[PDB]
Amino acid sequence: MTMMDMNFKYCHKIMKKHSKSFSYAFDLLPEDQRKAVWAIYAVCRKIDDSIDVYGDIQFLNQIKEDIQSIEKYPYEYHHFQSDRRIMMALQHVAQHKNIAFQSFYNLIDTVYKDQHFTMFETDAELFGYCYGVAGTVGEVLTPILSDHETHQTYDVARRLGESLQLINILRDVGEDFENERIYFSKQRLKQYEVDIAEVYQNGVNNHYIDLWEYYAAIAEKDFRDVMDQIKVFSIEAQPIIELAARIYIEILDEVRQANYTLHERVFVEKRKKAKLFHEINSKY
Ligand SMILES: N#CSCCOc1ccc(Oc2ccccc2)cc1
């Protein structure tokens, strides 16, 4: 194993530790493409977790500066200020693929904003957030997973990213609430007569289920529209991206099955993931 192999292996570790679902699917990609996905994912994870390093923006500022050095001098040697292993891997990717750097900056700006989080007034603000933390990631991944990127390719990837984010939110209501985060909009909470603190204390009720299902319907419709447009992606990536998406859709059924519980994180069994993969490959 070379030094760069070690860098990418560390990126893989970070990705698998954070999301088994995502890892399961994307580990099926060809070698060059899988490694690029690991590096991009890891950078994004590092940005997402940055604030809790010392409890301020110091590390996040360093990450941003590392990315800016890569963008402006992709072929110069850099002494990276943040996580060297991850930044060397990203630089290696950048030398071979067109990285949407403004997408990383959008993600970083979103993370900056999150330290003075206030609840979203409307669903438009919530969807803006889903773009910020997840749509941006889809945009960065676009050139890795497609051969000739058009505005359509980016559009579809962006939509998938945002659907996944919404599904994460739908899975993590209780956990987010404990961490003083509520992502459902105030508009929608008021309309459905829902109070998350109340529900966390007293269990689900029909108002909450209706509110939850309202958003779940959005995720599922977005999912189907992405499925209809799967051919913008390279032939190798299509089954993989379809797998990722299906595994996440199944997360919604896992929640319904646990009766929308706010007190544990539901999940799709590894064996169930293998089943979805079989069902999908059968038609590939
Ligand atoms: N965990 C979690 S929530 C994920 C948030 O960041 C993303 C977003 C999308 C994604 O897969 C995509 C593949 C192609 C295009 C767009 C997305 C992987 C990670």
Ligand SMILES: [Mg+2]
């Ligand atoms: Mg969440």
